[PDB]
Amino acid sequence: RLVVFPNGTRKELSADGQTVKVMFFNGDVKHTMPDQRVIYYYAEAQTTHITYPDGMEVLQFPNNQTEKHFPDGRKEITFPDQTVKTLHPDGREESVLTDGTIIQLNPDGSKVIQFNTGQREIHTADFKRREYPDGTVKTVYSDGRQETQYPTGRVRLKDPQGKVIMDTKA
């Protein structure tokens, strides 16, 4: 079949019967497949939008970025530089850089960086903290004080000039 609507939109079945092809008057194009997958091209935005039956949506942008919308509410963005950012329903954003570094932006204002080496940096308004696989924690406060927590339970606190003001262990 070919149907041409009064507004000039055309609905045409592919010759082999499998693809329903709508050519909208505004330049948009929609193909609907036998599995009910819908592929929609938006002409002005030059964007492709695929809707799967299970509700997943994938958008492909002309800058080469991809955005995938999961049934669990996550949205995963693949930038043109290959960075993959995941937006979680609770507001966390987690970027995985190509070298595998993970950068997490959290709703509370913090930024957490998980390096390949196992080290983890936590940045808040009040401190910058580094965590190490053995359990060591070094924290530098906005006022310049520095705390080292050792794997043993020992906690050593220094003033901003480096003088020890607290050194405790159970």
Author numbering: 955 to 1124
What does the report in the manuscript say about this coordinate set?
Of particular interest in this regard is the putative centriolar CPAP–STIL complex, as mutations in both components result in MCPH. CPAP and STIL are strictly required for centriole assembly: STIL at a very early stage and CPAP slightly later, possibly by controlling the organisation and length of the centriolar microtubules. Instead, we demonstrate that the TCP domain of CPAP constitutes a novel proline-rich-motif (PRM) recognition-domain that specifically binds to a short target motif in STIL. Our mutational analysis of the interface demonstrates a remarkable correlation between the ability of mutant proteins to bind to one another in vitro and their ability to support centriole assembly in vivo, providing compelling support for our structural model of the metazoan CPAP–STIL complex. These data strongly suggest that the interaction between CPAP and STIL is a conserved, essential step in centriole biogenesis.
To understand how CPAP and STIL interact at the molecular level, we obtained the crystal structures of the TCP-domain of D. rerio CPAP937–1124, both on its own and in a complex with D. rerio STIL408–428. In both structures, the TCP domain adopts a nearly identical conformation, suggesting that no significant conformational change occurs in CPAP upon binding to STIL (RMSD = 1.5 Å ± 0.2 Å over 148 ± 4 Cα pairs). The TCP domain folds into a single layer β-sheet comprising ∼20 consecutive antiparallel strands connected by type I β-turns and is stabilised by an extensive hydrogen-bonding network. The resulting sheet shows a twist of approximately 13° (i.e., the angle between the consecutive, hydrogen-bonded strands), slightly lower than the average value of 20° observed for typical β-sheets. Individual β-hairpins correspond to previously noted repeats in the TCP domain sequence; the turns of these hairpins are often constituted by a PDG motif explaining the high frequency of proline and glycine residues in this domain. Crystal packing interactions involve only small protein interfaces, suggesting that the protein is biologically active as a monomer. Indeed both small-angle X-ray scattering (SAXS) and size-exclusion chromatography—multi angle light scattering (SEC-MALS) experiments demonstrate that the TCP domain is predominantly monomeric in solution. The structure of the TCP domain represents an unusual, novel architecture. The TCP domain structure lacks a defined hydrophobic core typical for globular domains, and both sides of its β-sheet are exposed to the solvent and well hydrated. However, what, to our knowledge, makes the TCP domain structure unique amongst naturally occurring proteins is that it solely consists of a freestanding meander β-sheet that entirely lacks a defined hydrophobic core and is not flanked by other globular domains that pack against it.
